[PDB]
Amino acid sequence: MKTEQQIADIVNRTITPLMQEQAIPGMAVAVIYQGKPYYFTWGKADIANNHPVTQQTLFELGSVSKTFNGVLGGDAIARGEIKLSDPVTKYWPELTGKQWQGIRLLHLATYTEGGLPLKIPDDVRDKAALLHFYQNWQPQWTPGAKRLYANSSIGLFGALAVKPSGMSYEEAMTRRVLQPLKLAHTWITVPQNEQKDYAWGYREGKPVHSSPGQLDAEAYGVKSSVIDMARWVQANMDASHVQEKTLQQGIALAQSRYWRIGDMYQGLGWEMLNWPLKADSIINGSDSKVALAALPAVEVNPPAPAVKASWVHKTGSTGGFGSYVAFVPEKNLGIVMLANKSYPYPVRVEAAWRILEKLQ
């Protein structure tokens, strides 16, 4: 097995040119290797004010937030509070249009509802406007026909999934996921006494933070540190240490296979491919030209239970940040890459692959 110095050499050999070539001000990486997390930090969380990246720096996860959504939903399934087969109208009866009649929670959770838009429109800023938007949306195809990635589908799934609990989404996420997993540096809303650790994102050489929007927490609005993200990857890779039974089962359910889209399988938030695999499949699959395309979907019903021989991963971005998380349960190997600049998805995936390939 490799020493810490050997792992550091491997990580730095990839990250050093990456940050220079992509003009990334700050990064934090965790490698999970033979059961242990190894942490690395470089650069600046705030350039003008000279604040370094540390193991406590908070990064905007962007759509990596959907992995938290999927686990919270899995926990609700395990609690018996919801079933993915339930109609959306069980939880939002005011969606009375015929286009909602056959849409199930399953479809919202997995981008298979019929073609909701990538984001809720900017001018939808209250509950009345949100209802109007969904009521008047018209699908492009029947439920299950295609997978088309969106924030507005899984975002609504998260809002509906927590209804039986009587809690807000943020309250339920905190009580049911973050607190049991001891994720004390993971936030939907960063409190004032933690703002000192909230990195600035950089877009076109200017510091930026993400703007709020409807159903943001549910789809793209989580912030977290490298320590918490490593602990999150560890718990998702192997939840045998998680003593809360419904949370352990909910983690497993987010890695069930619900749909087959070529060689990719859709979990709850997490996306999976069989392992072993060819690097080009994930690198090319991460390009927006594939990842954002509407592709035919094949249902896996009942969902296939998690298998160890899988590459489990999720990309995410905001205006100023780019993140990537991936793990292989069979190998007990994983990686977290957090950066305060958005940079191309295939570059993220290739760098992660290069590191993990040397740690086989």
Author numbering: 2 to 361
In the authors' words:
CMY-185 is a CMY-2-like β-lactamase and was identified in an Escherichia coli clinical strain isolated from a patient who underwent treatment with ceftazidime-avibactam. CMY-185, possessing four amino acid substitutions of A114E, Q120K, V211S, and N346Y relative to CMY-2, confers high-level ceftazidime-avibactam resistance, and accumulation of the substitutions incrementally enhances the level of resistance to this agent. The substituted Y346 residue is a major driver of the functional evolution as it rejects primary avibactam binding due to the steric hindrance and augments oxyimino-cephalosporin hydrolysis through a drastic structural change, rotating the side chain of Y346 and then disrupting the H-10 helix structure. The other substituted residues E114 and K120 incrementally contribute to rejection of avibactam inhibition, while S211 stimulates the turnover rate of the oxyimino-cephalosporin hydrolysis.
